[PDB]
Amino acid sequence: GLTEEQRMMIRELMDAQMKTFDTTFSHFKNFRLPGVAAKWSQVRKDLCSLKVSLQLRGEDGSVWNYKPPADSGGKEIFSLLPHMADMSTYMFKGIISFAKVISYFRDLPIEDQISLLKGAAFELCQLRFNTVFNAETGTWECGRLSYCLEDGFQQLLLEPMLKFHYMLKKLQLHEEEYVLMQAISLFSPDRPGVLQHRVVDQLQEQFAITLKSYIECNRPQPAHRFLFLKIMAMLTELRSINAQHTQRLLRIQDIHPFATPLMQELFGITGSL
Ligand SMILES: C/C1=C/C(=O)c2c(C)coc2C/C(C)=C/CC1
């Protein structure tokens, strides 16, 4: 029940997703691993919000498992930051590649392309991570790497990022709906520095209309009443989570540098003290 324009739009997004989302993480390699005054108090609270163990399954069948330390007043809270920076960077590269495939995106001026990616890279990363999230085990399954939430569940949903992943996974979205959420997030006209606000706003509206129509044509079930509005509310929440985590990372970065050059570029860090 979609127009030909809407069908081609979804096709171009799915194509970009297929080409740029390495769902097995096969090419995530050479990453770092944890080694074998009121600022610090808040950096202490900032880091304890995402507490995961790490599993690495080798091709040979071997398994390495890392359990993180407890917070005990020292630098041990930073042990996983280089690894997560390498992951973030790998994911960001895929997101940048995704955007550059999309015709609606490459037709924007280069300055707006950069402003949009700076604004949304983190959000599209989280949308992709949600598709590998296992809500039954509290684990993001990234091919041969697994990230498992330390253990109750009601106390984990207090952290906005974790509640987001559980609540989004519960909607049981299709691949097509995930990629339309990525586009809606990517084409946000009100990111800092955007100049073609009107063109970007018009593109975002078309992506949201496509998503609304996709759901109407393919989801008649009572469980999916208001699904479009639930998705748009999650995107609003994702934007809030994005803002929280940008401030959170800039605080950590300020006392304990860890951002890769790509992250610095995305977060506006110039390289000068
Ligand atoms: C909440 C959370 C953190 C992240 O969003 C990132 C980022 C960003 C990079 O690596 C991770 C680890 C990962 C397995 C994802 C979900 C857990």
Count Cβ neighbours within 10 Å for each residue of 98-112 and write b for 16 or more, e otherwise: bbebbebbeebeeeb
For the Cβ of 133 lying below 6 angstroms from any atom of ligand 1, the answer is no
Report the candidate in 54, 79, 49, 74 with the shortest Cα–Cα distance to residue 64.
54
Task: Say whether 115 counts as a known binding-site residue.
Answer: no
Indicate the resolution in Å: 2.0
* SS3 state of residue 193: coil
Angle value at C-alpha 82, between 148 and 20, nearest 5 degrees = 70
Amino acid type, 24: T
What CA–CA distance (Å, rounded) separates 143 from 59? 11
Tokens of 112: 């707006």
Task: Say whether 13 counts as a known binding-site residue.
Answer: no
What CA–CA distance (Å, rounded) separates 90 from 84? 10
What CA–CA distance (Å, rounded) separates 107 from 113? 9
Query: Is residue 68 left, alpha or beta, with left meaning phi > 0 and alpha meaning psi from -120 to 50?
Result: beta
* SS3 state of residue 120: helix
Is-contact 232 183, C-beta < 8 A? no
- Domain residue spans in the chain? 1-273
What CA–CA distance (Å, rounded) separates 250 from 43? 10
For the Cβ of 125 lying below 6 angstroms from any atom of ligand 1, the answer is yes
Provide the experimental method for this PDB entry: X-ray
- Best substitution site from 128, 129, 161 to test ligand 1's pocket, by max atoms within 8 Å of Cβ? 129
Report the candidate in 198, 191, 203 with the shortest Cα–Cα distance to residue 117.
191
Tokens of 171: 């909607």
Is-contact 72 159, C-beta < 8 A? no
What's the length of the chain? 273
Task: Say whether 88 counts as a known binding-site residue.
Answer: yes
For the Cβ of 266 lying below 6 angstroms from any atom of ligand 1, the answer is no
